[PDB]
Write a protein that binds this DNA or RNA. Structure first.
Ligand code: MN
Ligand code: MN
Ligand code: PT
Ligand code: PT
Ligand code: PT
Ligand code: PT
Ligand code: PT
Ligand code: PT
Ligand code: PT
Ligand code: PT
Ligand code: PT
Ligand code: PT
Ligand code: PT
Ligand code: PT
Ligand code: PT
Ligand code: PT
Ligand code: PT
Ligand code: PT
Ligand code: PT
Ligand code: PT
Ligand code: PT
Ligand code: PT
Ligand code: PT
Ligand code: PT
Ligand code: PT
Ligand code: PT
Ligand code: PT
Ligand code: PT
Ligand code: PT
Ligand code: PT
Ligand code: PT
Ligand code: PT
Ligand code: PT
Ligand code: PT
Ligand code: PT
Ligand code: PT
Ligand code: PT
Ligand code: PT
Ligand code: PT
Ligand code: PT
Ligand code: PT
Ligand code: PT
Ligand code: PT
Ligand code: PT
Ligand code: PT
Ligand code: PT
Lengths: 82, 95, 97, 106, 97, 87, 106, 95
DNA sequence: ATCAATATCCACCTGCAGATACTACCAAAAGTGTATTTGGAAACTGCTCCATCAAAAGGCATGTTCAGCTGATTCAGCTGAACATGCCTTTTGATGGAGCAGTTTCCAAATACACTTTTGGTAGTATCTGCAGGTGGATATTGAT
DNA sequence: ATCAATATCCACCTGCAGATACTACCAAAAGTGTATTTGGAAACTGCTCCATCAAAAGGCATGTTCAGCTGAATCAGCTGAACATGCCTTTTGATGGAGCAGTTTCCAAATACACTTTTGGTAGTATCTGCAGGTGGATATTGAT
């Protein structure tokens, strides 16, 4: 019963996110569209965090790596250091 | 082992001055510390730019003041300026 | 035999999830996805637990906010149902496209 | 000896703020008043948020401030909201808000 | 007596203004607006003419870019006429709110 | 100095035709009647924000003259970087 | 006496770039390779834009690059567009682009 | 009668290299000078931050390289990293 | 309307994850004092370029007309919400080990510092040239019929 | 379709704004060479805290039904585009004069050690409690008739 990791972001999970976003009714094609959007979001952020890891010559991505990555994508996060 | 500095103790003090009966979870304290680091960076960053624009070698309270004016919204700016001007006077007029 | 009308439970869920702050994606599936995406940038990486957590927080913040804009776009077109073209428009206007 | 925080009448650490400015590469030099002014400003804004975050705690039947209370304080204050308009407070959630057109027809 | 149908001169003008780069707001009316607004912040200011020109290039690029977003919001609504609700939507999604 | 004219309602110096031209460059085909006041409104906000910061830079420099550079810095700060004026 | 530019095989002024890193207050120390590497990235980027801008000038039967040519060059190239996604080139105008539904008939 | 530096002559050299019969208007040159400064500021800035994050007091070609990767998109980053490495290698061998 | 199903609200209960107080310690801030370097205000004035202005040159304001767009109305049929649960994926918590992070070490490369050479900026004065915008005059594009 | 109004597309075409050219200077770069400090790489290791996995938990995939939403069609009514017309306002080129910014002089303020005292962070340790959820019971809300 093999499955893509992206598909692990399930319809009901996406449905909950939408709900917190105040969405009442959801078209069927939205779930695939959302997974795509998340994938681009994560690629851009992880790419940058990993760049921060490599520069530091570590093999572990630290929270700070991510926080720095977020800060420079203009999506500042509070709660994880820095 | 290596020293890890945080604004936490001083945040806790201020909380005690402002809601003496109220406490703070770790996670919230972590947020408050980010907030303090973030704002320092924003204000220092801008002060730094102002000094360069004007070919000065010093970041003075004047630069910090203008930085606050550029960065903070109106009412928040006004109070911050006065709080800050107030502390520099108090600091001067004390042996 | 009892039945709630289409949208009654939806409203009930909006209220519920707008009250709370827990992550709405299951931790493990999200972690695999994070690692797969990272594998394409560097091989044999480990992840701080808080690092994955930071990413989840940011991703869910992101998607929750995009669904607000999306919903305004649906409503601008006089619908109550969000469609990919709503997501698309929100992103183009945000300067993401 | 008397500390500069106490001289300035402040909880926030003038010494630390001063050091951080020097080692932060902001300019070749740093005037004496600037870390004072800056520490004041930081203290103030911290008091402002804690103030409102406290209330939010009380409003919700609670004594310990959590991330949710900082979120509600920030996004219900027009000014704090703008200053943190590009910030995400982890574990903060969102404001309860439903678009009226989505409300059931009474 | 000859007449182009409504829409035809409009498309002609789009091609025309999309092709050129001159400022589209008259200079002096714009300089006055700048002085009015600035004076309301601080009296007895002067302006280098390049400061005013810099403000104009910035303002016109800003308004042209907003009209593109606004146009997209109208079309999303299945209209071809831009309305204040379109501009308000563009600005809301842009974070200008 | 002896007398200097009073500045008022200069926003109306941004005429209907000027706004229409801007909308054309923006690809707009049909414009509803209320667009013109909305746009003037939006523009005045844009200018207030830019001029306020620029003027702030001016005063900090202790000058009476708003320079191209003051404007270019004000724009940079608001994430609307401008090339072509020494900036 | 060979300039550091010539030693690295570069048109862009390595001396200048080294100097500006000091005065810019970016770190305590500047490494010898840094202005070399930076002056080369600077020169690569300006070559990329002038290449494409010249093409636009030529596509237009013109001999002099003007601001509109820089704008067509940047906006027509996916990567330069993104790098200067939040930059305004004075006197560049916009790319001709009319939305489908606005065109006449069917 | 103070001196105002620009990248103009360097921009012109390079222009002759890539389009030998093409001129540049002084407004276009002004924009080009702004572009160079802007990119310089964005790379040095990332470099600055990156060093701090790693507790280093030296900006090296290695900081510049990561900044370049952080700042430039995809294919422009790839080519810039070559051009930079190339000039440093060449520079290392040439004294 | 009444009615019954099921969600929600509330008062009170309690174990424990996570907040807090209390002690000992040290390395490292943070400060106090004495020796030195300088950054930039001040006091003056050359001189670029800004506010001001008169004449000249072209865009804006207005009102009428109706083409076609918006927004209202209705409707059919398509599409997503609601539904119930045990399969199966995630969560939890226990356990070796990888690598982050602390420590010591030592020199390749940093800054500082003083004469020595070069060059990029402007400023004064001169000749050159690409194209903005005028022209007429052959090729579309549009909209009436 | 064919006919005619009127925008559009070239091609050449003279004036000139702004681009390119040289000859001189020169302050300030940029380079060169030796004396001095040191940041951080290199290498060894201790112990967090990370990936793995077994056992325990509890959310989601599943198909059916149909309520009510979306999008197609039709269309009255009215708003905004086109255009004619009449003329105000902006653009353009010329000029004494405010304020920027260029140079020089000088001390209040900062950097730099050095030495003296401290506090903030950690870590072992035990001690404490706010509140997440549990419960159970009344009460509201929704939907059926
Ligand atoms: Mn109080
Ligand atoms: Mn006024
Ligand atoms: Pt950190
Ligand atoms: Pt976690
Ligand atoms: Pt759709
Ligand atoms: Pt800096
Ligand atoms: Pt102008
Ligand atoms: Pt409308
Ligand atoms: Pt400048
Ligand atoms: Pt009823
Ligand atoms: Pt208890
Ligand atoms: Pt000290
Ligand atoms: Pt000096
Ligand atoms: Pt006219
Ligand atoms: Pt006329
Ligand atoms: Pt009609
Ligand atoms: Pt409609
Ligand atoms: Pt039906
Ligand atoms: Pt379906
Ligand atoms: Pt079950
Ligand atoms: Pt172990
Ligand atoms: Pt090991
Ligand atoms: Pt190991
Ligand atoms: Pt290491
Ligand atoms: Pt030269
Ligand atoms: Pt020379
Ligand atoms: Pt010259
Ligand atoms: Pt022409
Ligand atoms: Pt003609
Ligand atoms: Pt003609
Ligand atoms: Pt040098
Ligand atoms: Pt050392
Ligand atoms: Pt070291
Ligand atoms: Pt179970
Ligand atoms: Pt139905
Ligand atoms: Pt009609
Ligand atoms: Pt009308
Ligand atoms: Pt004067
Ligand atoms: Pt004067
Ligand atoms: Pt001055
Ligand atoms: Pt101390
Ligand atoms: Pt202490
Ligand atoms: Pt103590
Ligand atoms: Pt509870
Ligand atoms: Pt219960
Ligand atoms: Pt119950």
């Amino acid at each position: 019963v093999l499955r893509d990791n992206i598909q692990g972001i399930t319809k009901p999970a996406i449905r909950r996110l939408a709900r917190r976003g105040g969405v009442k009714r959801i078209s069927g094609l939205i779930y695939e569209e959302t997974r795509g959007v998340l994938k681009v979001f994560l690629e851009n952020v992880i790419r940058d965090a990993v760049t921060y890891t490599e520069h530091a010559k570590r093999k572990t991505v630290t929270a700070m790596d991510v926080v720095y990555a977020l800060k420079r994508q203009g999506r500042t996060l509070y709660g994880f250091g820095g | 082992k290596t020293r890890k500095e945080s604004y936490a103790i001083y945040v806790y003090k201020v909380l005690k001055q402002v809601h003496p009966d109220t406490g703070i979870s770790s996670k919230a304290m972590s947020i408050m510390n980010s907030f303090v680091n973030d704002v320092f960076e924003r204000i220092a960053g801008e002060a730094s730019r102002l000094a360069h624009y004007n070919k000065r070698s010093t970041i003075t309270s004047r630069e910090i003041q203008t930085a606050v004016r550029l960065l903070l919204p109106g009412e928040l700016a006004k109070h911050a300026v006065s709080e800050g001007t107030k502390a520099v006077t108090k600091y001067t007029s004390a042996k | 035999p009892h039945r709630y009308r289409p949208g009654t439970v939806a409203l009930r869920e909006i209220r519920r999830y707008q009250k709370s702050t827990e992550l709405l994606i299951r931790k493990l599936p999200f972690q695999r996805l994070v690692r797969e995406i990272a594998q394409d940038f560097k091989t044999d990486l480990r992840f701080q637990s808080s690092a994955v957590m930071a990413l989840q927080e940011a991703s869910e913040a992101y998607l929750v906010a995009l669904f607000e804009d999306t919903n305004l776009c649906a409503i601008h077109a006089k619908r109550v149902t969000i469609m990919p073209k709503d997501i698309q428009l929100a992103r183009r206007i945000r300067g993401e496209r | 000896a008397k500390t500069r925080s106490s001289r300035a009448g402040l909880q926030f650490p003038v010494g630390r703020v001063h050091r951080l400015l020097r080692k932060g590469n902001y300019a070749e030099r740093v005037g004496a008043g600037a870390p004072v002014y800056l520490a004041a400003v930081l203290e103030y804004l911290t008091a402002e948020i804690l103030e409102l975050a406290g209330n939010a705690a009380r409003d919700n039947k609670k004594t310990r401030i959590i991330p949710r209370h900082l979120q509600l304080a920030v996004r219900n204050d027009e000014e704090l909201n703008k200053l943190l308009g590009r910030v995400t407070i982890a574990q903060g959630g969102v404001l309860p808000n439903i678009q009226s057109v989505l409300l059931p027809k009474k």
